[PDB]
Protein backbone atom coordinates (compact mmCIF):
# COMPACT_ATOMS: atom_id res chain seq x y z
CA UNK A 1 0.00 0.00 0.00
CA UNK A 2 2.99 2.27 -0.52
CA UNK A 3 1.00 4.53 -2.83
CA UNK A 4 -1.88 4.26 -0.41
CA UNK A 5 0.12 4.42 2.80
CA UNK A 6 1.40 7.69 1.38
CA UNK A 7 -2.23 8.53 0.65
CA UNK A 8 -2.91 8.18 4.37
CA UNK A 9 0.12 10.32 5.21
CA UNK A 10 -1.17 13.01 2.88
CA UNK A 11 -4.49 12.51 4.63
CA UNK A 12 -3.55 13.16 8.24
CA UNK A 13 -0.70 15.60 7.65
CA UNK A 14 -3.12 17.25 5.27
CA UNK A 15 -5.60 17.54 8.15
CA UNK A 16 -3.18 19.12 10.60
CA UNK A 17 -2.07 21.47 7.84
CA UNK A 18 -5.74 22.26 7.23
CA UNK A 19 -6.43 23.47 10.70
CA UNK A 20 -3.15 25.36 10.89
CA UNK A 21 -4.48 27.08 7.77
CA UNK A 22 -7.76 27.84 9.53
CA UNK A 23 -5.78 29.56 12.27
CA UNK A 24 -3.77 31.39 9.63
CA UNK A 25 -5.62 34.54 10.67
CA UNK A 26 -3.45 36.71 8.43
CA UNK A 27 -6.11 37.25 5.85
CA UNK A 28 -4.65 40.64 4.85
CA UNK A 29 -3.06 43.77 6.15
CA UNK A 30 -5.32 46.67 5.36
CA UNK A 31 -3.44 49.80 6.34
CA UNK A 32 -5.57 52.87 6.97
CA UNK A 33 -3.93 56.14 7.89
CA UNK A 34 -3.25 51.90 10.78
CA UNK A 35 -2.63 48.53 9.37
CA UNK A 36 -4.95 45.63 9.97
CA UNK A 37 -3.84 42.12 10.80
CA UNK A 38 -7.28 40.74 10.59
CA UNK A 39 -8.15 37.28 11.79
CA UNK A 40 -11.23 35.16 11.41
CA UNK A 41 -12.55 35.82 14.94
CA UNK A 42 -11.41 39.44 15.30
CA UNK A 43 -9.60 42.05 13.26
CA UNK A 44 -6.45 43.45 14.79
CA UNK A 45 -4.82 46.78 14.08
CA UNK A 46 -1.14 47.53 13.51
CA UNK A 47 2.13 51.79 14.85
CA UNK A 48 0.08 51.45 18.01
CA UNK A 49 -1.23 47.88 18.04
CA UNK A 50 -5.01 47.56 18.27
CA UNK A 51 -7.68 44.96 17.64
CA UNK A 52 -11.43 44.55 17.34
CA UNK A 53 -13.96 41.77 17.00
CA UNK A 54 -16.73 41.80 14.42
CA UNK A 55 -18.39 45.21 14.48
CA UNK A 56 -21.74 44.10 13.01
CA UNK A 57 -23.32 42.12 10.19
CA UNK A 58 -24.72 41.76 14.50
CA UNK A 59 -27.89 42.13 16.56
CA UNK A 60 -31.41 43.55 16.34
CA UNK A 61 -34.16 40.92 16.54
CA UNK A 62 -35.30 42.06 13.09
CA UNK A 63 -36.95 39.87 10.45
CA UNK A 64 -37.49 39.31 6.72
CA UNK A 65 -34.73 39.33 4.16
CA UNK A 66 -31.83 41.74 4.00
CA UNK A 67 -31.77 41.98 7.78
CA UNK A 68 -31.54 38.19 8.01
CA UNK A 69 -28.68 38.60 5.56
CA UNK A 70 -26.85 40.73 8.09
CA UNK A 71 -27.47 37.83 10.45
CA UNK A 72 -25.90 35.72 7.72
CA UNK A 73 -22.63 37.67 7.69
CA UNK A 74 -22.63 37.01 11.39
CA UNK A 75 -23.28 33.29 10.83
CA UNK A 76 -21.10 32.93 7.78
CA UNK A 77 -17.95 32.33 9.81
CA UNK A 78 -19.94 29.65 11.64
CA UNK A 79 -20.68 28.20 8.24
CA UNK A 80 -16.95 28.18 7.53
CA UNK A 81 -15.18 26.47 10.37
CA UNK A 82 -17.34 23.55 11.60
CA UNK A 83 -17.71 21.74 8.29
CA UNK A 84 -13.94 21.78 7.91
CA UNK A 85 -13.32 20.47 11.42
CA UNK A 86 -15.86 17.69 10.86
CA UNK A 87 -14.13 16.68 7.63
CA UNK A 88 -11.02 16.33 9.74
CA UNK A 89 -12.82 14.19 12.32
CA UNK A 90 -13.55 11.85 9.46
CA UNK A 91 -9.99 12.03 8.16
CA UNK A 92 -8.61 10.60 11.36
CA UNK A 93 -11.67 8.34 11.40
CA UNK A 94 -10.31 6.38 8.47
CA UNK A 95 -6.72 7.02 9.47
CA UNK A 96 -7.14 4.49 12.28
CA UNK A 97 -10.30 2.70 11.11
CA UNK A 98 -8.84 1.83 7.70
CA UNK A 99 -8.09 -1.51 9.29
CA UNK A 100 -11.18 -3.27 10.76
CA UNK A 101 -15.27 -3.03 6.42
CA UNK A 102 -17.91 -0.61 5.12
CA UNK A 103 -17.75 2.16 7.72
CA UNK A 104 -14.28 2.36 6.25
CA UNK A 105 -15.75 3.14 2.85
CA UNK A 106 -19.02 4.63 4.15
CA UNK A 107 -17.10 6.86 6.49
CA UNK A 108 -14.55 7.87 3.87
CA UNK A 109 -17.36 9.16 1.73
CA UNK A 110 -18.70 11.14 4.65
CA UNK A 111 -15.13 12.30 5.29
CA UNK A 112 -14.64 13.89 1.97
CA UNK A 113 -18.10 15.38 1.60
CA UNK A 114 -17.41 17.11 4.89
CA UNK A 115 -14.10 18.03 3.28
CA UNK A 116 -16.18 19.28 0.37
CA UNK A 117 -18.22 21.90 2.17
CA UNK A 118 -15.00 23.77 2.94
CA UNK A 119 -14.53 25.79 -0.24
CA UNK A 120 -18.21 26.67 0.10
CA UNK A 121 -17.25 28.02 3.51
CA UNK A 122 -14.55 30.04 1.86
CA UNK A 123 -16.80 31.66 -0.75
CA UNK A 124 -19.18 32.47 2.07
CA UNK A 125 -16.25 34.08 3.88
CA UNK A 126 -15.01 36.19 1.02
CA UNK A 127 -18.36 37.65 0.29
CA UNK A 128 -18.79 38.45 3.93
CA UNK A 129 -15.53 40.27 3.36
CA UNK A 130 -17.47 41.69 0.43
CA UNK A 131 -19.61 43.51 2.92
CA UNK A 132 -17.09 46.30 2.29
CA UNK A 133 -6.91 45.82 -1.74
CA UNK A 134 -4.85 43.13 -0.03
CA UNK A 135 -5.56 39.63 1.17
CA UNK A 136 -3.83 36.78 2.94
CA UNK A 137 -2.43 33.50 1.88
CA UNK A 138 -4.23 31.40 4.49
CA UNK A 139 -7.19 31.36 2.13
CA UNK A 140 -5.22 29.97 -0.77
CA UNK A 141 -3.72 27.35 1.54
CA UNK A 142 -7.10 26.09 2.67
CA UNK A 143 -8.71 26.15 -0.75
CA UNK A 144 -6.06 24.03 -2.41
CA UNK A 145 -5.65 21.80 0.61
CA UNK A 146 -9.24 20.60 0.64
CA UNK A 147 -8.98 19.74 -3.03
CA UNK A 148 -5.90 17.70 -2.22
CA UNK A 149 -7.10 15.61 0.71
CA UNK A 150 -10.42 15.06 -1.06
CA UNK A 151 -8.80 13.72 -4.22
CA UNK A 152 -6.38 11.53 -2.28
CA UNK A 153 -8.58 9.59 0.08
CA UNK A 154 -11.44 9.50 -2.38
CA UNK A 155 -9.29 7.78 -4.97
CA UNK A 156 -8.59 5.53 -2.04
CA UNK A 157 -12.35 5.04 -1.59
CA UNK A 158 -12.41 3.87 -5.18
CA UNK A 159 -9.63 1.49 -4.30
CA UNK A 160 -11.82 0.12 -1.51
CA UNK A 161 -14.79 -0.44 -3.78
CA UNK A 162 -12.47 -2.07 -6.31
CA UNK A 163 -10.38 -4.23 -3.99
CA UNK A 164 -13.04 -5.22 -1.47
CA UNK A 165 -16.04 -5.40 -3.70
CA UNK A 166 -14.81 -6.33 -7.15
CA UNK A 167 -11.54 -7.99 -6.28
CA UNK A 168 -12.93 -10.00 -3.41
CA UNK A 169 -16.05 -10.74 -5.42
CA UNK A 170 -13.75 -12.26 -8.01
CA UNK A 171 -11.98 -13.91 -5.09
CA UNK A 172 -15.36 -15.54 -4.58
CA UNK A 173 -15.80 -16.36 -8.27
CA UNK A 174 -14.69 -19.86 -7.19
Amino acid sequence: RGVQMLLTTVGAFAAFSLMTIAVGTDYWLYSRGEVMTHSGLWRTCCNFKGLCKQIDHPEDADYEADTAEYFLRAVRASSIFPILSVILLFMGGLCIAASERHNIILSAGIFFVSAGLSNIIGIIVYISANAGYSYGWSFYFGALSFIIAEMVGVLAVHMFIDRHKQLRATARAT
Binding site: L106, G109, V113, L117, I120, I123, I124, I127, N130
Partner: protein
Protein backbone atom coordinates in the same frame (compact mmCIF):
# COMPACT_ATOMS: atom_id res chain seq x y z
CA UNK B 1 -28.99 48.20 -17.99
CA UNK B 2 -25.24 48.26 -18.10
CA UNK B 3 -24.35 51.46 -19.88
CA UNK B 4 -27.71 52.93 -18.99
CA UNK B 5 -26.34 52.82 -15.50
CA UNK B 6 -22.74 53.48 -16.45
CA UNK B 7 -23.62 56.23 -18.90
CA UNK B 8 -25.24 58.01 -15.96
CA UNK B 9 -23.61 60.91 -14.12
CA UNK B 10 -23.37 66.87 -12.84
CA UNK B 11 -21.37 70.10 -13.05
CA UNK B 12 -22.13 73.21 -11.00
CA UNK B 13 -24.92 75.75 -10.53
CA UNK B 14 -25.57 75.63 -14.27
CA UNK B 15 -26.54 71.99 -13.74
CA UNK B 16 -29.40 73.04 -11.45
CA UNK B 17 -30.83 75.31 -14.14
CA UNK B 18 -30.48 72.84 -17.02
CA UNK B 19 -32.64 70.30 -15.19
CA UNK B 20 -35.87 70.23 -13.18
CA UNK B 21 -36.01 66.72 -11.72
CA UNK B 22 -34.09 67.90 -8.65
CA UNK B 23 -35.80 70.82 -6.90
CA UNK B 24 -33.76 73.48 -5.11
CA UNK B 25 -34.20 76.62 -3.03
CA UNK B 26 -32.69 79.02 -0.51
CA UNK B 27 -33.57 80.64 2.82
CA UNK B 28 -36.86 82.56 2.68
CA UNK B 29 -35.03 85.64 3.98
CA UNK B 30 -31.39 86.69 3.72
CA UNK B 31 -28.62 87.85 1.40
CA UNK B 32 -28.65 84.41 -0.20
CA UNK B 33 -32.21 84.77 -1.49
CA UNK B 34 -31.85 88.47 -2.27
CA UNK B 35 -28.76 87.57 -4.29
CA UNK B 36 -30.61 85.59 -6.96
CA UNK B 37 -33.45 88.12 -7.03
CA UNK B 38 -31.10 91.00 -7.86
CA UNK B 39 -28.59 88.95 -9.86
CA UNK B 40 -28.46 89.88 -13.54
CA UNK B 41 -26.21 86.94 -14.41
CA UNK B 42 -27.45 84.46 -17.03
CA UNK B 43 -27.48 81.24 -14.99
CA UNK B 44 -28.54 82.73 -11.65
CA UNK B 45 -31.36 84.56 -13.43
CA UNK B 46 -33.10 81.39 -14.61
CA UNK B 47 -32.58 79.82 -11.19
CA UNK B 48 -34.42 82.68 -9.48
CA UNK B 49 -37.21 82.57 -12.06
CA UNK B 50 -37.77 78.93 -11.11
CA UNK B 51 -37.57 79.39 -7.34
CA UNK B 52 -39.77 82.49 -7.53
CA UNK B 53 -42.79 80.50 -8.71
CA UNK B 54 -41.84 76.96 -7.69
CA UNK B 55 -44.59 75.01 -5.93
CA UNK B 56 -44.59 73.91 -3.25
CA UNK B 57 -42.36 76.56 -1.65
CA UNK B 58 -38.70 75.73 -2.25
CA UNK B 59 -37.73 78.20 0.47
CA UNK B 60 -37.24 77.14 4.09
CA UNK B 61 -37.76 78.98 7.38
CA UNK B 62 -34.38 78.23 8.97
CA UNK B 63 -31.07 76.68 7.92
CA UNK B 64 -31.87 73.55 9.93
CA UNK B 65 -35.09 73.08 7.97
CA UNK B 66 -33.19 73.34 4.69
CA UNK B 67 -30.67 70.68 5.68
CA UNK B 68 -33.48 68.43 6.90
CA UNK B 69 -35.22 68.83 3.54
CA UNK B 70 -32.08 67.67 1.75
CA UNK B 71 -31.67 64.68 4.07
CA UNK B 72 -35.29 63.57 3.65
CA UNK B 73 -35.76 64.06 -0.10
CA UNK B 74 -33.46 61.21 -1.13
CA UNK B 75 -31.47 63.62 -3.28
CA UNK B 76 -34.51 65.28 -4.85
CA UNK B 77 -33.93 68.63 -3.14
CA UNK B 78 -30.83 70.83 -3.09
CA UNK B 79 -30.22 73.67 -0.64
CA UNK B 80 -28.23 76.84 -1.38
CA UNK B 81 -26.37 78.40 1.54
CA UNK B 82 -23.10 79.98 2.68
CA UNK B 83 -20.10 77.76 1.95
CA UNK B 84 -18.76 78.26 5.47
CA UNK B 85 -21.83 76.81 7.19
CA UNK B 86 -22.14 74.18 4.46
CA UNK B 87 -18.60 72.84 4.84
CA UNK B 88 -19.27 72.53 8.57
CA UNK B 89 -22.52 70.61 8.07
CA UNK B 90 -20.66 68.14 5.86
CA UNK B 91 -18.51 67.34 8.90
CA UNK B 92 -21.49 66.53 11.12
CA UNK B 93 -23.35 63.25 11.65
CA UNK B 94 -24.76 61.33 10.02
CA UNK B 95 -22.38 62.70 7.37
CA UNK B 96 -25.06 62.60 4.67
CA UNK B 97 -24.47 66.00 3.06
CA UNK B 98 -21.77 67.35 0.75
CA UNK B 99 -20.87 70.61 -1.00
CA UNK B 100 -20.62 70.46 -4.79
CA UNK B 101 -18.93 72.79 -7.26
CA UNK B 102 -17.30 76.13 -6.52
CA UNK B 103 -18.93 79.15 -4.90
CA UNK B 104 -21.42 81.29 -6.84
CA UNK B 105 -19.98 84.59 -5.63
CA UNK B 106 -17.00 86.03 -3.75
CA UNK B 107 -17.63 87.29 -0.21
CA UNK B 108 -15.56 87.53 2.96
CA UNK B 109 -15.77 88.09 6.71
CA UNK B 110 -13.71 90.69 8.55
CA UNK B 111 -13.01 92.26 11.93
CA UNK B 112 -15.27 95.28 12.42
CA UNK B 113 -14.03 98.38 14.24
CA UNK B 114 -15.76 101.74 14.89
CA UNK B 115 -15.01 104.35 12.22
CA UNK B 116 -11.85 106.24 13.12
CA UNK B 117 -10.80 103.88 15.91
CA UNK B 118 -7.32 103.38 17.37
CA UNK B 119 -7.47 99.60 16.94
CA UNK B 120 -8.24 100.15 13.26
CA UNK B 121 -4.86 99.88 11.54
CA UNK B 122 -3.33 97.50 14.13
CA UNK B 123 -6.08 94.88 13.78
CA UNK B 124 -6.00 95.18 9.98
CA UNK B 125 -2.30 94.33 9.84
CA UNK B 126 -2.83 91.62 12.45
CA UNK B 127 -5.29 89.82 10.18
CA UNK B 128 -2.85 89.97 7.27
CA UNK B 129 -0.06 88.69 9.51
CA UNK B 130 -2.16 85.77 10.76
CA UNK B 131 -3.12 84.70 7.24
CA UNK B 132 0.47 84.79 5.96
CA UNK B 133 1.59 82.70 8.92
CA UNK B 134 -1.08 80.23 7.84
CA UNK B 135 -2.60 80.68 11.28
CA UNK B 136 -6.02 81.47 9.83
CA UNK B 137 -6.04 78.37 7.62
CA UNK B 138 -4.85 76.40 10.64
CA UNK B 139 -7.72 77.63 12.81
CA UNK B 140 -10.31 76.71 10.18
CA UNK B 141 -8.87 73.21 9.83
CA UNK B 142 -9.04 72.92 13.62
CA UNK B 143 -12.76 73.63 13.91
CA UNK B 144 -14.03 72.37 10.55
CA UNK B 145 -12.13 69.18 9.71
CA UNK B 146 -9.93 68.27 12.69
CA UNK B 147 -12.70 68.80 15.24
CA UNK B 148 -15.10 67.37 12.67
CA UNK B 149 -16.96 64.08 13.05
CA UNK B 150 -16.82 63.08 9.39
CA UNK B 151 -13.52 61.99 7.88
CA UNK B 152 -14.92 58.55 7.11
CA UNK B 153 -17.81 59.48 4.81
CA UNK B 154 -14.07 54.67 -6.65
CA UNK B 155 -13.38 53.07 -10.09
CA UNK B 156 -16.77 51.64 -11.23
CA UNK B 157 -16.31 47.85 -11.30
CA UNK B 158 -18.46 44.75 -11.93
CA UNK B 159 -21.65 43.59 -10.14
CA UNK B 160 -19.98 40.88 -8.09
CA UNK B 161 -22.63 40.94 -5.33
CA UNK B 162 -25.78 39.68 -7.06
CA UNK B 163 -23.53 37.35 -9.03
CA UNK B 164 -22.29 36.02 -5.70
CA UNK B 165 -25.78 35.23 -4.49
CA UNK B 166 -25.92 33.15 -7.65
CA UNK B 167 -22.74 31.45 -6.50
CA UNK B 168 -24.19 30.44 -3.17
CA UNK B 169 -27.63 29.33 -4.29
CA UNK B 170 -25.77 27.52 -7.05
CA UNK B 171 -23.87 25.80 -4.25
CA UNK B 172 -27.16 24.80 -2.67
CA UNK B 173 -27.70 22.92 -5.89
CA UNK B 174 -24.26 21.40 -5.45
CA UNK B 175 -24.68 19.95 -1.98
CA UNK B 176 -28.22 18.97 -2.89
CA UNK B 177 -27.01 16.74 -5.70
CA UNK B 178 -24.42 15.59 -3.17
CA UNK B 179 -26.52 14.21 -0.35
CA UNK B 180 -29.45 13.03 -2.45
CA UNK B 181 -27.15 11.06 -4.72
CA UNK B 182 -25.31 9.75 -1.66
CA UNK B 183 -28.20 8.24 0.27
CA UNK B 184 -29.71 6.96 -2.95
CA UNK B 185 -26.53 5.18 -3.99
CA UNK B 186 -25.55 3.64 -0.70
CA UNK B 187 -28.98 3.43 0.77
CA UNK B 188 -30.99 2.41 -2.28
CA UNK B 189 -28.46 -0.13 -3.52
CA UNK B 190 -26.99 -1.22 -0.18
CA UNK B 191 -30.52 -1.37 1.18
CA UNK B 192 -31.76 -3.73 -1.52
CA UNK B 193 -28.69 -5.96 -1.62
CA UNK B 194 -28.50 -5.89 2.17
CA UNK B 195 -32.02 -7.28 2.19
CA UNK B 196 -31.13 -9.77 -0.55
CA UNK B 197 -29.37 -12.32 1.62
Amino acid sequence: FLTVERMVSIESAEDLSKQTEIAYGTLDSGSTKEFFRRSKIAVFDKMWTYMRSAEPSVFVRTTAEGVARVRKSKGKYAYLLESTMNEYIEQRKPCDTMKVGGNLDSKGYGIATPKGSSLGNAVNLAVLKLNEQGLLDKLKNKWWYDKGECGSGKTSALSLSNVAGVFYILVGGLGLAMLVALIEFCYKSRAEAKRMK
